[model samples]
Target chain A: GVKVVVDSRELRSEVVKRLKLLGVKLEVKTLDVGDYIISEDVAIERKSANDLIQSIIDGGLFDQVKRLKEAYSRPIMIVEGSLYGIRNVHPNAIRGAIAAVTVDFGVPIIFSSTPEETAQYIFLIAKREQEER
Target chain B: GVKVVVDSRELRSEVVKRLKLLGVKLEVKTLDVGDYIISEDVAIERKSANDLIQSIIDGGLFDQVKRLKEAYSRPIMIVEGSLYGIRNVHPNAIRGAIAAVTVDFGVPIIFSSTPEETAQYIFLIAKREQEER
Candidate 1:
């Protein structure tokens, strides 16, 4: 069985609910970096389109990415939804932030259209990390 | 106008055709690192799911990612397709490679479902880099 260590704050999210439905084992805790820990070497940061823009504006996006990278050997970010029209921020600003996250920071960004899809991606990744070995 | 320096090898791709129809200015060249150069600092590597697997097997993926990152301040990878079921390679190996790319190399990976969608992502990123000052 695949196991993921989920942050306590994400307990109410639909992604977590789907994880439960999918029967992946979860260990919930108050994580200081990523929202989900896939393996000892892998960690996942789940952000919606709205959260990404807000995090960028709040000047916490890169810092969070940095911390996540520093904390985990493998840091992955799952950004859900289209990165457009979520807020009044310039689309360019959003793209620019994405560029910095990937290019400047060297983290991998994965996109998901919905929470269920996010759950699927996570499940597959977790399975690959835990079971396929 | 958004201008992208595309590698001549991608000339016949549907993504290139979409870029043409979308009216994003294209500057085709023989790029040694990435498939598309969005700006002075940003370079994009466009790979289909198959390409990713094949590249990984061929041992060119990380070397290419390294050169892409080394050549540009901002290197971005746009993988257009799901990383599942396409090849006989174990899904775990694929996920493991992904983990290495992000965590070890520090390059960002973006996923797209189709070439048209890929074109759209490239357009938006190019626009962000060239415009929105």
Candidate 2:
């Protein structure tokens, strides 16, 4: 069984759909604070490629990772969209940001190519989380 | 001696001087994440009135509170400038932001009229944390 703390907005809703279609026992909680929380323990913070870099520029990424981690037990991050060798961001910058998220926080980071893939990853993580419990 | 985890930039340096003069045994660690951390246990997040609202608009504040709190034993936020009755924002908006930080994070938010006051609050908070520990 799983519970999702997600807002019914955009990709989150679609993730909800795929999660159900996968035959995972789940409940969707709307208007929650973070992007999604599974079993009130593990949570996910989704960032589009552009938004992730923008957050780093404004000093949000470094700071938000801590907050997102604290509010849940197993906090994870999903970066959705194109990244790696983008014209605007250096390769080092991308690696640095991802490294900090995983190393500094000891949280897992997942990269998704599209909304559909993002939804699939969400279900995979939720299922893995459940089996572990 | 209290170790202050703070960046060597902007108002942070001035705050270092003030904390030292106040007979607060303090060591400043430059280039650390978050605004300041005291005794490696408590951290202080400083934000300007405008920046505070801007972060709220960008959905950073709500998320950062958890991270700030998780990274330290007792993390506190010091809002370092004018907040109420600003032309660009409604008064109610300010109240709501402050309330959310307090209630959601369980972290204290101190409003400072000047950098000196910010220093005082930092010392005050550090001392209290020491006593409690």
Candidate 3:
């Protein structure tokens, strides 16, 4: 599977939509970070949007995400961009969301500080999977 | 060990009286259904009074009973008169009483449907114990 690493939310959404339009069975998993993974045909995209999504979720949004994941069985990806200013601005909210996810789903998480690092991590994961297979 | 089952709440009270009368260390266990076992010289008595006592407990008189069990270890024997009219009238209350004892204590309970049954059951239990020992 080829992994595309990017930092733009717009690009991420656009690629996901395009894949879905092509009937490629795309799955989008949201993570604590604003990162998501779009998987369909041996390709993965890792990117960072605003860490604001995590704060909003921590503020009591997406509580049903666990139930959704249980029902859907999809991977959760966190974009690194959402982590900025998260420590000093609203650490509790961020921590709460992380706690909720861990308690409910135990989803594996990936954290990247920059878009480039995020892409590299995805590449490494994909490479490892390929070697294992 | 001998098991004596009797029906007079007052008379049955006397058997316990006599056993205690003799210097036998008796262990009295109270049951939800009110059939008691007195062990010292080997005697069990089942008795019935006005059936009013059971009704009193059915009226939430034993709300603290649950807590009492937790704080102390003792046998709980319910006298049989309490089950009178327990089926058609205030069934919920009686049901709740039985439920509470079971849920909180899981204590073995002997139900004396009648004064005779109460005495017989207690006698039988005592008889079995004496044989085993």
Candidate 4:
């Protein structure tokens, strides 16, 4: 399962190596949105909780979600941080916003508690793409 | 919380009486947006997951979120459903939209798992209005 399209901005350098370890094939292309397109049909946009909150508040990430969804068949948002615990803002600020975006719009979000977990989910998702595609 | 400006269309009747029981106050005036304004500064727009999803997809809710923010100091949205499990639409459809709105738009959403919870949130928020005023 190597046909993942990836956005080049701020992507962790190690993820490519990690996915390779899973025997997952890779196609790295610089993109305007999303961290990885696990399949031709599914794209996952990754953000940390703080960055997720900031981007949503600042209005940068939403546009990309909109754009990516338009370009790809399935666009998912994955958050790399904790939703319940926060230092700078109220937990509700993050919780409430996550709730609204997921419930109100058809944007899907995957939560990865750690980088390894993120790669694991990517492995499974890409496998689904393998089976179905 | 009598400064609670309201949208005249389709507001629940018993909730008003319910709020009254908690020694809460409300000033109901017609508005272009929001279900209840618990205080002069805080506005709560009530929505079911279905209505919320439809509005977001059809672009009505987004416009209102934009407008209500421009008009008020704090605009909160209350959803009348659970975020985890759903029957009609995929849960992600609901979850993703809500997250984008609250997170992306800086629109705060309070989830009311039941009618009772919705009133409870309104009651508590209105009580905050009581203490602050």
**What are the models' TM-scores?**
0.64, 0.46, 0.31, 0.49
Candidate 3 root-mean-square deviation in Å: 27.1
Ranking by lDDT: 1, 2, 4, 3
In candidate 4, stretches whose alpha carbon ends up further than 4 angstroms from where it belongs are: A9-12, A59-61, B1-133
Q: lDDT per residue, candidate 3, A49-79, as tens digits?
A: 4533543655533544443354434444434
> Where does the lowest 10-residue lDDT sum fall in candidate 2 chain B?
B99-108
lDDT of 4 by residue, A1-133 (tens): 4456656663455666677788876766787666787755677777777788777567676576678778776666767756544566654455545554553345656565666656666666666567767
- What is the two-chain DockQ of model 3? 0.01
Tens digit of lDDT per residue, candidate 3, span B1-133?
4643332343445445654343333444443322344333223223243343444555633553443344334333434544534454553344334433432243223334454444344444454455665
lDDT of 1 by residue, A20-88 (tens): 899999998998778999887888899989899899889899889988889987788888888745767
- The alpha-carbon deviation from the true structure for residue B71 of candidate 2, after best TM-score superposition, in angstroms, is 26
Off by over 4 Å in 2: A1-3, A10-13, A30-32, B1-133
DockQ preference between candidates 1 and 2, better one = 1
Interface DockQ of each model:
0.32, 0.02, 0.01, 0.05
Report residue B102 deviation for candidate 2 (angstroms): 33
All candidates' chain B TM-scores are 0.90, 0.80, 0.48, 0.80
In terms of lDDT, model 4 sits at: 0.64
Per-model CA lDDT versus the true structure? 0.81, 0.65, 0.40, 0.64
Q: Highest DockQ among the candidates is held by which one?
A: 1
Can you tell me the CAPRI class of model 4? incorrect
